[PDB]
Design a protein around this nucleic acid. Structure first.
Lengths: 65, 103, 435, 54, 100, 234, 100, 63
RNA sequence: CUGAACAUUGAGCCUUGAUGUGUAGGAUAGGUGGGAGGCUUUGAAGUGUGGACGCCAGUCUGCAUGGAGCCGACCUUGAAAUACCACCCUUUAAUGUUUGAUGUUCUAA
RNA sequence: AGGCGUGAUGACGAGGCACUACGGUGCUGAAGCAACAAAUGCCC
RNA sequence: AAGGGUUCCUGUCCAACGUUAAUCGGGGCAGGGUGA
RNA sequence: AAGGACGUGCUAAUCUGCGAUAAGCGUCGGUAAGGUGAUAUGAACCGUUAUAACCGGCGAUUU
RNA sequence: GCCCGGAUAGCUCAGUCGGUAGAGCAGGGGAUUGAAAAUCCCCGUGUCCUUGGUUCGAUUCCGAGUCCGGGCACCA
RNA sequence: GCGGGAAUAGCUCAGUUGGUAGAGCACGACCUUGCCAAGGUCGGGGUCGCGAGUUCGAGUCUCGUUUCCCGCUCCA
């Protein structure tokens, strides 16, 4: 059923954001009120984030029953 | 007489600093002037009003004599007084060091 | 100072960051309209904006419009702040733990790694509570999801998923762009507000009429408020008296040099909001309850106040002036800076420490806080006077300025606190031999 | 007297100028740029959505 | 640590754990429960950076500590004065002997 | 000395007596103090202004009076008895070596005119010292009418009365008898007053005729009025 | 006039800081450094003509200075007078007193 | 200095020095001494200006 | 600085009286010149007083009586000689005094 | 000189009741008379 | 009182100075303070 | 008056100079591109060749 | 110990020209008296302080020695 | 041990270039008085301490000696 299906992907998706977040990003991706690794460069990591924003819009439509 | 200006050109008669020039930042009441970049010493500076303000060993202008520097004219480094011999009602400077007759 | 901002703008590094930010805000606005499988973002966004009477203003200030005009989820930034708080307890206990945190590069990594683990446990608890609560009070929720077994299961899962996504999002942005990230969300809220207001100025245009006069006044107004808040805030009463004399000579005289000013002549934006939320809140809690059928008595008291000092505007206004004044005088508590100053050693110049130093230090803070109270009220008044001839406003009045100020001051402070350091370091390394 | 005493203190207190305020003004302009932006993309994304779901 | 402390105050003032005003009143529309808006913000602070190509700022706040040297004495206690004494000592003699 | 007898008494009782009357009144009074019937020595006491006494400032000399003395003219010669002008050009009573010297200097003689000749006068001045009241001694000038000693002794035999000075400068000279007549007296007086004037000693003080007194023996006297240059103006 | 501008030259600095000079302005009186004028009457008439303060008893006390015990020659701080002027009206909030 | 003194006039200058001393230096020196308006350059002027006016009066009875 | 009168008292010229005694000189030698002498009628002398000595037989004279004539021995010794007439000083007296002393009285310094 | 009115129906007051940040502050208040013995002091 | 002249008190600092040590003191440092 | 006492600066002790017009003031001239004496030179400011500052004559103030 | 002096017939003492020692008072006798005092006369006893020396002969000259009387340092 | 004093009549006591050397009392002879006082007269006497030196002349001057005396060694 639609609502379940998005959810399974979402949880896989999360794991991926974290993986990205630690290497380029700084191991402070969430809340850390300092910063120390992005800004310099363009990376992989921006795209995972971009995806997340985009992703949220996608989820409901699909989910919509 | 004088040889001082607050922008004076020198050819520098100070050893280890000859063949150089610089504006006269300020004229001191000590027979000294400050010529650009040649009086720099590394100065173990201790912040006062201490803030972010850097300590370190900072390059800081000292001051050398006016009689241990020599003027630059306009094509020659010669110095043998600048003439104040002309009065227009006030003494006016000119070169007689090389006799190019300009301040 | 002006000269300083301008310089940055010329150099490459800034331009890349500034570009990113305009993109970043957009990403947030887009997200907000399209719904959630769990509650339903678009429906939530509309309702909030509407009217609501008393209830809407209290909710609105604290929020800043952040996602009260651009509603999505019901968790995200709050888990990060909660988590960030637990680590602050942990730091206090153990000195060593605190030290790593303070050093910025180390400090940041620690906070997220700990926060993500914390956030997950914490979040499930919050979500369950949120999920039960939301259906009951109206009867109904969403329109991509509707109340039932299905709404509860979806709602928990969806808040958690969202919360993690946001946390990563917030981090990529901070370094890429300028201004903290937490700040950006809040900022979008200000943006969401803007079209209704804009439409009205556009209509007025120039034509040489009342409407022409008002446009010119409004343009001016926005700036003025901003300027006035700013002048006071820096405003410093700055007394430098060197302790002893310590013989003479050196400079003009070598004394033990104590230059103390920590004075802020305003009361501070976060305090201001606080006082305002609190008066509103008992009534607002009541009003919903009353309607449902529950705490009818609590509502009845709220209604009673209207026969004295009438009008919906009149009770609140009068109360708000007194309250700003009151809050400030008594206590120095919900302003951090005030507390900090007192704890560290110091002594008032000319005075011998004891009872007399304690007395004097408090007195300045008591004045200072009162001063702030006065200034906030004066900005709010100017619209109120203006409007009766001019046209009624609706986004250019009083509890909005407070909402606008807190998000900016802070966003701005952060861009400086990273940005100045960053440039200095970058410059420095290159001179050394170092990318 | 209590309000006044607070005022009486203010007039001396206000110092440590923001002759700087043109920086704040320059920042205001930068804050403005952003607003304009959220609205534009919102029309682009929204437009894609309007075809599908509107 | 300083920043976190400001965050905490903001949250506290919420007196509802942030925006959590139950739906109702007059306008309809389901109810939510909100995130945790706010900011943070900085404050004296730090900064500076003689950068700008056309600008220059300062600082604000701090302290100091000088103990220098106080030296003088004892040296500055034997030259700035003089402890001269004539040492008055009497030695009464003793006669009476018969050397005749 | 002075007697109580009537003629003596009336002058004697008066203190500062013997006052000066004109010469005629003088001589008229003088006669009547006695009865003529006996000889009596009429003297003149002519007073010279010298107060010089027993000194060589005495005036002594000798003048020839045209008449006798009051006891009848008799002569005794002070001699050396080997004289040349007193034993060989005027003679003497005897040539006594000091047989006659004694007699003069003895002070008891019945000869009136005591003739002097040298016995020493170049070493004895006009001195009155231990000389005789009756007797005498040659003095530098023995004359005053002759400035010769030789001729004086001649003069003395003719009838010269040798007169000499007193305590009050008194030149006593025997004028005559009382049995003389007024005119016979006058002539003598004049001879003696003029003699003192003519010459005097130049080894002494001067002359000048003060008081001229005239007296007879046993009675007193009274004096004749003088101008001191002439008895013929007063 | 009643007095010249040179009998209104009598104040060159107040005293408004630390012990018995903040305490004894809040609780009682007012206190100011009064040059070295050596008068009490003209200081009463100073705060009449200039300002508009009303006073009670005006108290005069000579201050003999205080040591600077590092020498060079004599040292020590210069003489001055302190006066408790004493309010009866005004109730001034520091750097106010009157002026029209 | 120059033109200042020279354009002074008896009646005028008399009332001008009262202003100088009192309520343009009187306020200043008290404020400055407590650090509440301490600007050292302002202290140097005013003082050495009010002086000038009095000079003319006892010299020649104003300009 | 400091005066007037009057009283008393030595001594100098003197003026007028009475002794002026050494030794020798019978006795009467301050002294100096005249000088062998006085009887002038209440007058010296004489008779008596005082002063001089009694040293070789004496007299002088103040002053009273007294109209009433004596004695240096009319010697002679000595440095000087006596009566008596001038007249000196002392002892002494009175005058003229000159001078030094004290006193007294007074008032004018 | 000293006693008694009055000044003073007030102050002060043993001791209690409150809170606190632990610096301290607020809250309250009984009796307050009588007799005898005193100084080198006071009347003096 | 005389006399001293800030030595008082307050916070600090300890090289020299108190017969020691000395965190302390009347020492150094600078404030505050004597009100008719 | 000589000579002092006590003040006097941007502030702080003394030194220097000067007196409540107080490290000066005016006036006339000289002079001038740099200055605001020193221990301790700082802070704030001023003037820039022609108006500061410095030097002198004269005057003012000169407790 | 240190220098000086005296040492006498009963009691008290004289005693240098060395050569045979006397004076007084006691005491006895005679003169005086009536008898006595007093006063006069005469009387002897010293082997002249011991022992040597000078001498024909020393008590009396000399040298010691005794007893007694004179004058002189315990210690600075 | 030293420095200065004297030995003169029985007794107490003068003098002295060294010329014939003295007093008062006692004593001798008288006198007043019965007789003695008191009173009154008139006499004697010296190895001049002893021996020399000086000299015509010593006691002293001079020198030796015996006896009798004072003043000093305070001062050191």
């Amino acid at each position: 059923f639609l609502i379940v299906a998005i959810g399974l992907v979402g949880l896989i998706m999360l794991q991926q954001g974290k993986g990205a977040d630690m290497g380029a990003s700084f191991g402070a991706g969430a809340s850390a009120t300092l910063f120390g690794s992005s800004g310099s460069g363009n990376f992989m990591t921006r795209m995972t984030a971009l995806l997340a924003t985009l992703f949220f819009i996608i989820s409901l439509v699909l989910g919509n029953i | 007489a004088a040889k001082i200006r607050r922008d004076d050109e020198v050819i520098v008669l100070t050893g280890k600093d000859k063949g150089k020039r610089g504006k006269v930042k300020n004229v001191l009441s000590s027979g000294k002037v400050i010529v650009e970049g040649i009086n720099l010493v590394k100065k173990h500076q201790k912040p006062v009003p201490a803030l972010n303000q850097p300590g370190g060993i900072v390059e800081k202008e000292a001051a050398i004599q006016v009689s241990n520097v020599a003027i630059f004219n306009a094509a020659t480094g010669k110095a043998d007084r600048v003439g104040f011999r002309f009065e227009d009602g006030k003494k006016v400077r000119f070169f007689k060091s090389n006799s190019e007759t300009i301040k | 100072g002006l000269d300083f901002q301008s310089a940055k703008g010329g150099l490459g590094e800034l331009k890349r960051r500034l570009l990113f930010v305009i993109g970043a805000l957009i990403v947030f606005r887009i997200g907000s309209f399209i719904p959630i499988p769990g509650i339903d973002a678009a429906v939530l966004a509309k309702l909030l904006e509407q009217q609501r009477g008393t209830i809407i203003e209290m909710f609105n200030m604290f929020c800043g419009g952040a996602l009260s005009r651009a509603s999505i989820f019901a968790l995200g930034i709050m888990p990060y702040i909660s988590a960030s708080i637990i680590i602050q307890l942990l730091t206090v206990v153990h000195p060593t733990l605190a030290e790593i945190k303070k050093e910025g590069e180390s400090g940041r990594r620690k906070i997220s790694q700990y926060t993500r683990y914390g956030t997950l446990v914490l979040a499930i608890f919050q979500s369950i509570g949120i999920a039960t609560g939301l259906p009951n009070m109206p009867g109904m929720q969403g329109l991509v999801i509707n109340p039932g077994f299905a709404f509860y299961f979806t709602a928990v899962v969806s808040l958690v998923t969202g919360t993690m996504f946001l946390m990563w999002l917030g981090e990529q942005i901070t370094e890429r762009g300028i201004g903290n990230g937490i700040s950006i969300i809040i900022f979008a809220g200000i943006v969401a507000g803007l079209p209704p207001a804009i439409a009205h100025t556009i209509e007025q245009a120039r034509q040489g009429d009342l409407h022409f006069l008002v446009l010119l006044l409004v343009a001016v107004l926005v700036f003025a408020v901003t300027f006035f808040v700013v002048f006071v805030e820096r405003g410093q009463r700055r007394i430098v008296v060197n302790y002893a004399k310590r013989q003479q000579g050196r400079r003009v005289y070598a004394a033990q040099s104590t230059h103390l000013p920590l004075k802020v002549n305003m009361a501070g934006v976060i305090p201001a909001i606080f006082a305002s939320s609190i008066i509103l809140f008992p009534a607002t809690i009541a009003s919903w309850f009353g309607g449902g059928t529950g705490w009818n008595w609590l509502t009845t008291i709220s209604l009673y106040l209207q026969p004295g000092q009438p009008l919906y505007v009149l009770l609140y206004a009068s109360a708000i002036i007194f309250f700003c004044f009151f809050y400030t005088a008594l206590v120095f508590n919900p302003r951090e800076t005030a507390d900090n100053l007192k704890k560290s050693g110091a002594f008032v110049p000319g005075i011998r420490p004891g009872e007399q130093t304690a007395k004097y230090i408090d007195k300045v803070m008591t004045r200072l806080t009162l001063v702030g109270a006065l200034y906030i009220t004066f900005i709010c008044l100017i619209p109120e006077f203006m409007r009766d001839a001019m046209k009624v406003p609706f986004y250019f009045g009083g509890t909005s300025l407070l909402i606008v100020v807190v998000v900016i001051m802070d966003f701005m402070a952060q861009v400086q606190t990273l940005m100045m350091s960053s440039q200095y370091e970058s410059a420095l390394k290159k001179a050394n031999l170092k990318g | 007297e209590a309000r006044t005493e607070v005022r009486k203190v203010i007039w001396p207190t206000r110092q440590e100028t923001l002759h700087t305020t043109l920086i704040v003004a320059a920042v205001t302009a930068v804050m403005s740029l952003i607003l304009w932006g959220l609205d534009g993309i919102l029309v682009r994304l929204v437009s894609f959505i309007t075809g599908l779901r509107f | 640590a300083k920043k976190i402390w400001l965050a905490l105050a903001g949250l506290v003032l919420a007196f509802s754990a942030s925006c959590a005003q139950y739906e109702d009143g007059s306008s309809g529309e389901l109810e939510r429960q909100h995130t945790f808006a706010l900011h943070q913000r900085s404050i004296s602070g730090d900064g500076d950076s003689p950068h700008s190509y056309h600008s220059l700022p300062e600082g604000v706040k701090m302290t100091k500590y000088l103990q220098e040297q106080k030296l003088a004495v004892a040296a500055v206690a034997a030259q700035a004065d003089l402890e001269l004494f004539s040492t008055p000592v009497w030695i009464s003699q003793a006669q009476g002997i018969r050397a005749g | 000395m002075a007697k109580l007898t009537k003629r003596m008494r009336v002058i004697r009782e008066k203190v500062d007596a013997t006052k000066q009357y004109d010469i005629n009144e003088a001589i008229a009074l003088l006669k009547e103090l006695a009865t003529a019937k006996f000889v009596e020595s009429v003297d003149v006491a002519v007073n010279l202004g010298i107060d010089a006494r027993k000194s060589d400032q005495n005036v002594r000399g000798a003048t020839v009076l045209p008449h006798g003395t009051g006891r009848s003219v008799r002569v005794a010669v002070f001699t050396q008895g080997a004289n040349a002008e007193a034993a060989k050009a005027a003679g003497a009573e005897l040539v006594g070596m000091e047989d006659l010297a004694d007699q003069i200097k003895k002070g008891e003689m019945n000869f009136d005119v005591v003739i002097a000749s040298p016995d020493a006068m170049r070493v004895v001045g006009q001195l009155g010292q231990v000389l005789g009241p009756r007797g005498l001694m040659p003095n530098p000038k023995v004359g005053t009418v002759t400035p010769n000693v030789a001729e004086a002794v001649k003069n003395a035999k003719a009838g010269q009365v040798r007169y000499r000075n007193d305590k009050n400068g008194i030149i006593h000279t025997t004028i005559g008898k009382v049995d003389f007549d007024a005119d016979k007296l006058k002539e003598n007086l004049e001879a003696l007053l003029v003699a003192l004037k003519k010459a005097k000693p130049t080894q002494a003080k001067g002359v000048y005729i003060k008081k001229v007194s005239i007296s007879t023996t046993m009675g007193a006297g009274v004096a004749v009025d003088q101008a001191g240059l002439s008895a013929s103006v007063n | 006039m009643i007095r010249e501008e040179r009998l209104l030259k009598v104040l060159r600095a107040p005293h408004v800081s630390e012990k018995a000079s903040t305490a004894m302005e809040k609780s009682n009186t007012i206190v100011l450094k009064v040059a070295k004028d050596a008068t009490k009457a003209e200081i009463k008439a100073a705060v009449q003509k200039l300002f508009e303060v009303e006073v009670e008893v005006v108290n005069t006390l000579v201050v003999k200075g205080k040591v600077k015990r590092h020498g060079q020659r004599i040292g020590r701080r210069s003489d001055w007078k302190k006066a408790y002027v004493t309010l009866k009206e005004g109730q001034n909030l520091d750097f106010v007193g009157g002026a029209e | 200095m120059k033109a200042k003194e020279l354009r002074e006039k008896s009646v005028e200058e008399l009332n001008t020095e009262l202003l100088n001393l009192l309520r343009e230096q009187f306020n200043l020196r008290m404020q400055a001494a407590s650090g509440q308006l301490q600007q050292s350059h302002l202290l140097k002027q005013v003082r050495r200006d009010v002086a000038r006016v009095k000079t003319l009066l006892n010299e020649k009875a104003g300009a």
